[PDB]
Ligand binder design. Sequence first.
Ligand SMILES: NC(=O)c1ccc[n+]([C@@H]2O[C@H](COP(=O)([O-])OP(=O)(O)OC[C@H]3O[C@@H](n4cnc5c(N)ncnc54)[C@H](OP(=O)(O)O)[C@@H]3O)[C@@H](O)[C@H]2O)c1
Length: 486
Amino acid sequence: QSDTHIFIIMGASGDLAKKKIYPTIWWLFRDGLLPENTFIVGYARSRLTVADIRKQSEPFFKATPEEKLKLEDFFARNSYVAGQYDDAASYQRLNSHMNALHLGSQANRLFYLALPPTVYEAVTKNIHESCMSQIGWNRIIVEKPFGRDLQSSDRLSNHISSLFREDQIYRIDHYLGKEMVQNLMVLRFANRIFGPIWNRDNIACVILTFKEPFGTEGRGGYFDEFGIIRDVMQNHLLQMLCLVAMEKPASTNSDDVRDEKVKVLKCISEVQANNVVLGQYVGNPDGEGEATKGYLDDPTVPRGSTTATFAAVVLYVENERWDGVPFILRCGKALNERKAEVRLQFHDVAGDIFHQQCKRNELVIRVQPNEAVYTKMMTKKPGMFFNPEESELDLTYGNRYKNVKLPDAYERLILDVFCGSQMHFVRSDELREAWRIFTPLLHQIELEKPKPIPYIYGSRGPTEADELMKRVGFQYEGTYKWVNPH
Ligand SMILES: NC(=O)c1ccc[n+]([C@@H]2O[C@H](COP(=O)([O-])OP(=O)(O)OC[C@H]3O[C@@H](n4cnc5c(N)ncnc54)[C@H](OP(=O)(O)O)[C@@H]3O)[C@@H](O)[C@H]2O)c1
């Protein structure tokens, strides 16, 4: 478009703006992906100049010498307004500043809230009252947390919705910006090989996994307030569940997609303790550096905290496609690897003619690291043998698409806000369902304070988690052997 566009970084002085938002909007700018007439306005409490923003942020830009002119033009299009987050006069100054930009009263305005949630309500109120374009569109970009339970999320939502239409609100769940998460829809709905088997007649279980190999890294006191279910399970994992489970949408229009996601969540009952395993990591005495330290060995964590650093939970989608199929959500810190993954395990073939030698087929979508899709399946054992053995059909992006840069999630998502595409942003009704599913459990945990099961730093987590997975119908043999073909 030829319209002026203004990108307002609310909280421009903070760490997140410095290390992530300023570098992302630079990358989009550098790559020629933004509108020609774009300006960037920082707003925060400190009395900073553009030269200070540049000094703090440009080390994270990965700028090259050849980009020097583009960089000069980028900083020429930047400005900074000092102000407080609930001061009417400050927002007035911000509005006037924006009006003074080239066609500024006409401009489309995008507000990125690079702020803590304790100022969300004051910032949204003030933007609405003072800084909205009367001609351009107005879009607000908000990051987690969105409440900490159903009642607290409803309060924020009801505040924002009283001021902003759903088509002005862009709630980030950054998994929705990742390459292979966005692929889930194409894989499922562009292919006949995945279509007729994607149902309860063929699928024994679905496993949605998020593992990190580091602990809390001295920042445990922050984590301790919310825990792993609020951090990862209620948002990122549940989003992956929705994209795995959803019926095929009427179109790829933003709200046809998000309608199908909500429809999935509305069929999920509130999870109970029965289907939950919680863990907390302890130090590995045979380990090195951080790995010798448990969760309670972080001095910012409250003494005797029972906060879980690991959760496995089983949900069920109560509908025709999914009736009975367990969806296992599993996540933890200080585990054996970094990995996020979707895995479908297929049922056994009926009418076995291979004398119980066959294993269940599996489809794996590995989100990170090392983006890949593969199907574990049976082939005749190569050479002079007749017995089936497990093998796979593989697609690895690092080998197949060596030269192709995959954008960071924040690159993709910020660009989507410019384009007005809400497909990959969390809708108000979707948010509410997510909290409805998990709030009873979260409240029970806060009330009864169950003691999480210790697991050692660097392990796969508590063995009770594997037991839960087996109980609900996941089969593990440990016979599959993969050799990296390179
Ligand atoms: N293109 C590629 O890069 C590619 C393609 C094919 C295979 N491979 C590699 O080959 C290796 C094996 O592949 P895979 O992980 O798909 O198959 P797998 O080793 O058969 O593992 C299947 C699943 O079982 C889980 N598990 C492990 N022990 C368990 C237990 N005792 N009880 C219950 N569940 C258990 C694993 O958990 P975890 O998630 O905790 O391990 C994994 O989720 C992996 O390293 C994989 O990365 C790579």
